[PDB]
Design an enzyme around this catalytic site. Sequence first.
Site, PDB file in Angstrom:
ATOM      1  N   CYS A 123       1.334 -15.756 -13.324  1.00 32.71           N
ATOM      2  CA  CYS A 123       2.548 -16.414 -13.786  1.00 32.71           C
ATOM      3  C   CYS A 123       2.274 -17.736 -14.495  1.00 32.71           C
ATOM      4  O   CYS A 123       3.227 -18.440 -14.847  1.00 32.71           O
ATOM      5  CB  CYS A 123       3.512 -16.639 -12.614  1.00 32.71           C
ATOM      6  SG  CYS A 123       2.965 -17.862 -11.407  1.00 32.71           S
ATOM      7  N   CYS A 165      -2.478 -20.162 -12.019  1.00 35.16           N
ATOM      8  CA  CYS A 165      -2.290 -18.767 -11.651  1.00 35.16           C
ATOM      9  C   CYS A 165      -2.505 -17.864 -12.858  1.00 35.16           C
ATOM     10  O   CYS A 165      -2.085 -18.179 -13.974  1.00 35.16           O
ATOM     11  CB  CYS A 165      -0.892 -18.550 -11.078  1.00 35.16           C
ATOM     12  SG  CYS A 165      -0.582 -16.868 -10.512  1.00 35.16           S
ATOM     13  N   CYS A 201      -7.437  41.320   0.497  1.00 30.83           N
ATOM     14  CA  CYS A 201      -7.654  42.659   1.030  1.00 30.83           C
ATOM     15  C   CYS A 201      -7.887  43.647  -0.108  1.00 30.83           C
ATOM     16  O   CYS A 201      -7.139  43.640  -1.092  1.00 30.83           O
ATOM     17  CB  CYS A 201      -6.459  43.098   1.872  1.00 30.83           C
ATOM     18  SG  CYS A 201      -6.597  44.768   2.550  1.00 30.83           S
ATOM     19  N   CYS A 231       4.345 -17.432  -6.991  1.00 32.10           N
ATOM     20  CA  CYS A 231       4.450 -15.983  -6.882  1.00 32.10           C
ATOM     21  C   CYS A 231       3.637 -15.397  -5.736  1.00 32.10           C
ATOM     22  O   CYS A 231       4.026 -14.363  -5.187  1.00 32.10           O
ATOM     23  CB  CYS A 231       4.022 -15.316  -8.193  1.00 32.10           C
ATOM     24  SG  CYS A 231       2.261 -15.434  -8.560  1.00 32.10           S
ATOM     25  N   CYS A 243      -6.664  41.647   7.762  1.00 27.02           N
ATOM     26  CA  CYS A 243      -5.418  41.673   7.008  1.00 27.02           C
ATOM     27  C   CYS A 243      -4.276  41.981   7.969  1.00 27.02           C
ATOM     28  O   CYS A 243      -4.274  43.029   8.622  1.00 27.02           O
ATOM     29  CB  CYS A 243      -5.479  42.713   5.891  1.00 27.02           C
ATOM     30  SG  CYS A 243      -3.891  43.061   5.101  1.00 27.02           S
ATOM     31  N   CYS A 299      -2.200  45.354   6.857  1.00 27.88           N
ATOM     32  CA  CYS A 299      -2.826  46.668   6.859  1.00 27.88           C
ATOM     33  C   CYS A 299      -3.891  46.859   7.927  1.00 27.88           C
ATOM     34  O   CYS A 299      -4.256  48.007   8.203  1.00 27.88           O
ATOM     35  CB  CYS A 299      -3.451  46.968   5.487  1.00 27.88           C
ATOM     36  SG  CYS A 299      -2.292  47.642   4.275  1.00 27.88           S
ATOM     37  N   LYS A 355     -12.522 -29.266 -11.666  1.00 24.75           N
ATOM     38  CA  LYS A 355     -13.079 -29.328 -10.319  1.00 24.75           C
ATOM     39  C   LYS A 355     -12.771 -30.648  -9.617  1.00 24.75           C
ATOM     40  O   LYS A 355     -12.548 -30.661  -8.401  1.00 24.75           O
ATOM     41  CB  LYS A 355     -14.589 -29.096 -10.365  1.00 24.75           C
ATOM     42  CG  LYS A 355     -15.191 -28.715  -9.023  1.00 24.75           C
ATOM     43  CD  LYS A 355     -16.264 -27.651  -9.176  1.00 24.75           C
ATOM     44  CE  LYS A 355     -16.994 -27.409  -7.866  1.00 24.75           C
ATOM     45  NZ  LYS A 355     -16.049 -27.125  -6.751  1.00 24.75           N
ATOM     46  N   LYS A 356     -12.757 -31.767 -10.349  1.00 23.65           N
ATOM     47  CA  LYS A 356     -12.589 -33.061  -9.689  1.00 23.65           C
ATOM     48  C   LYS A 356     -11.166 -33.239  -9.168  1.00 23.65           C
ATOM     49  O   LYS A 356     -10.958 -33.867  -8.124  1.00 23.65           O
ATOM     50  CB  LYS A 356     -12.971 -34.208 -10.629  1.00 23.65           C
ATOM     51  CG  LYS A 356     -12.062 -34.395 -11.832  1.00 23.65           C
ATOM     52  CD  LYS A 356     -12.564 -35.486 -12.768  1.00 23.65           C
ATOM     53  CE  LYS A 356     -12.387 -36.868 -12.160  1.00 23.65           C
ATOM     54  NZ  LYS A 356     -12.781 -37.947 -13.110  1.00 23.65           N
ATOM     55  N   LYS A 357     -10.177 -32.702  -9.878  1.00 25.34           N
ATOM     56  CA  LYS A 357      -8.786 -32.786  -9.455  1.00 25.34           C
ATOM     57  C   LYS A 357      -8.348 -31.603  -8.605  1.00 25.34           C
ATOM     58  O   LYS A 357      -7.219 -31.609  -8.104  1.00 25.34           O
ATOM     59  CB  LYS A 357      -7.864 -32.895 -10.674  1.00 25.34           C
ATOM     60  CG  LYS A 357      -8.462 -33.632 -11.856  1.00 25.34           C
ATOM     61  CD  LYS A 357      -7.428 -33.819 -12.955  1.00 25.34           C
ATOM     62  CE  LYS A 357      -8.084 -34.139 -14.285  1.00 25.34           C
ATOM     63  NZ  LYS A 357      -7.148 -33.941 -15.425  1.00 25.34           N
TER      64      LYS A 357
END
Lengths: 89, 92
Positions: free
Chosen positions: B86, B83, B4, B66, B20, B23, B76-78
Site C-alpha cells: 500500500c 510497505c 470384467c 494494511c 465382479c 456376474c 537504516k539510521k531512521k
Amino acid sequence: MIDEKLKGYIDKRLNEIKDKIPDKLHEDLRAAIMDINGVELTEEDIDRIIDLTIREYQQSLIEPGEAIGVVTAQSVGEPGTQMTLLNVT
Amino acid sequence: MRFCPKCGSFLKVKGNKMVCSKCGYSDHDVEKVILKENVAHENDKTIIADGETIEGRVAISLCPRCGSVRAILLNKKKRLYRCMTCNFVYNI
Ligand SMILES: [Zn+2]
Ligand SMILES: [Zn+2]
C-alpha cells in the site's frame, strides 16, 4: 538563565490565575516560560505572556445555541468521500 | 484399473481375487489402485517480523495500515520503511 528573583516573580504571578484556565494549560504555560533561554526576560514580558494566554483561551470558547451535532456529522462524513484506499479492512 | 471380460463392469479386490459383483467373475491378477493427493506448505511457516533485510532492501516488517509483512528499508539510521502493498511509509 532565569535568576531566582524573576522565577519567584513568575511563580507569584502564575498563582493568581489558577482558576482562570484549565490545569493542563496552566502546566503547559509554566513549563514553556521556564525554557526561555538566550533572551533577557523582563517582568512586563511575563505579564504580557500571561495576559495573552488567558485572553487567547477565553476567545476560543464555543457559543451557546450552536448546532454542534450537524457540524460534527459534517466534519466526520465529509472526509469519508476523500478516502482513496493480513490485509485488514 | 480393470474391467470384467464379460459384464464390462470394474473389478474390485477381495482377498486374493478380483470379483465382479454383477456376474461373479474371478481372476488371479491383482492390481492395486490408490488415490494420492499432495499438500503444499511453501508459505505456512511462522513469521518473525524483525526489520532485517533478506535481499537488497527487502525486509520483513508488519505494516501499521494494511498489515502486510513486506517492506522496503528506505533508510537504516531512521528505521524508515515503506510497505510494498500500500506504499505506506512508517517507522519501526
Ligand atoms: Zn462381470
Ligand atoms: Zn501496507
